[PDB]
Enzyme design. Sequence first.
Site: not given
Length: 330
Positions: A35, A199
Amino acid sequence: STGSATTTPIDSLDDAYITPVQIGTPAQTLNLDFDTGSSDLWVFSSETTASEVDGQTIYTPSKSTTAKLLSGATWSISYGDGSSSSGDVYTDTVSVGGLTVTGQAVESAKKVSSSFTEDSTIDGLLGLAFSTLNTVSPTQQKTFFDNAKASLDSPVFTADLGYHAPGTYNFGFIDTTAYTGSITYTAVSTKQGFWEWTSTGYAVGSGTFKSTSIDGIADTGTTLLYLPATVVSAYWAQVSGAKSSSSVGGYVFPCSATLPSFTFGVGSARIVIPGDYIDFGPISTGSSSCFGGIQSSAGIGINIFGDVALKAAFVVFNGATTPTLGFASK
């Protein structure tokens, strides 16, 4: 040193991925959920409330000659999906894919929430976010990656998640045969303890690319792709009959639909998520309403590039002094 381990979807929807981890001496192999959005390595154990264990493989520290109780140490964690776990702490030898850390904090669960109990395939989590998020008290502990770093050939690990298929976590090296073209690296903020990056925008299907900054985290422990409501709305508008359902808890779509791809930007580069990756199947057995793999982050408080996005790429988690993230197509 290096390590290399295969990671395997737990079910037909790629809801999560498990990676075998050797703990203790002799080795006890547990299948953990790697994770990159948390920083605790915790396991179902011989200390776990018996009614809260249902099929998991447990760590038994008393059977490990290298296990040592970390005196006074406790841990307690809550995840974004509302699940939780807590217990005490041992140090022991932990190996991933041939890579060994001695003195790793292994957090032994005394209690786990129903979600973990109900998932017999996941024996625990191995956190790979920054150690500043580790919940051990009163002495915060380091992640497996942090402990391994100095020993590694290169201070990196890579995530190569499969679509409906096994993939690979590598530690200490970049497998240049595992991706196509070049790796595009992008800046990371560690301010929130995550692999947080920005992004450069998105496209829906064959649509034009929208240049826009989307701050989010690379999180292998989250199944889906959570993005701003504007983005998610633009995506599902291209799917006939798709709608946001409060009763289901997100965007659903007719199972008869062919989904469009979704492209996200990494600097000047582009990662394309095929439409099929965004299908998470009937909301309930036999239903013709299917659950969407792109969902709104509104009310999460953060955008999450979970498995839906990451499995479309070869991802480099660069843990150099100034960390960065790399993405390549594959």
